[PDB]
């Protein structure tokens, strides 16, 4: 009976500092090669890595993902897996959460 609206977060250090921002009514065009994104689907979190994400941003995102899983929401299964997804190699369990997916994007 679980009803899950997925949440997409962009993790970026381009701005100067590092923030994870939740992306309202997200779509595929919100994803970008330069950044890492977290797609929280409740029973797992996809860790989506853009083609041109740097190591510094990836590590920052990894910390936010591990920190994030504590704070929001509380009362959440500690064995929630983080699943690595690389840009252009997204599995159907990932793309299935988007209203529309263009497989020729990028």
Report on this structure.
The protein is α+β, with helices and mostly antiparallel strands and 106 residues long. The chain has one domain: Severin. It is 20% helix and 24% strand. The chain is built from two helices and five strands, in the order ββββαβα. The protein has helices at residues 55-71, 92-95; strands at residues 7-12, 19-22, 36-40, 45-49, 82-86. The chain has a five-stranded mixed sheet with strand order 2-1-3-4-5, with helices on one face. Helix 1 links the parallel strand 4 and strand 5 (82-86). The longest helix is centred in the middle third of the chain and has 17 residues, at 55-71. It is globular, with a radius of gyration of 13 Å. It starts with 6 loop residues before the first strand and ends in an 11-residue tail after the last helix.
What attributes characterize this protein structure?
106 residues, alpha+beta, Severin, five-stranded mixed beta sheet, 2 helices, 5 strands, 24% strand, globular, structural protein, actin binding protein, Villin head piece, villin, gelsolin
């Amino acid at each position: 009976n679980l009803v899950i609206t997925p949440r997409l977060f962009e993790c970026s250090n381009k701005t100067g500092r590092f923030l994870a921002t939740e992306i309202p009514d997200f779509n595929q065009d919100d994803l970008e090669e330069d950044d890492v994104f977290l797609l929280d689907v409740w029973d797992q979190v996809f860790f989506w890595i853009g083609k041109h994400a740097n190591e510094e941003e990836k590590k920052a995102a990894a910390t936010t993902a591990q920190e994030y899983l504590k704070t929001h929401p509380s009362g959440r299964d500690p064995e929630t897996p983080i699943i690595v997804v690389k840009q252009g190699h997204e599995p159907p369990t990932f793309t299935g959460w988007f209203l529309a997916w263009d497989p020729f994007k990028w």
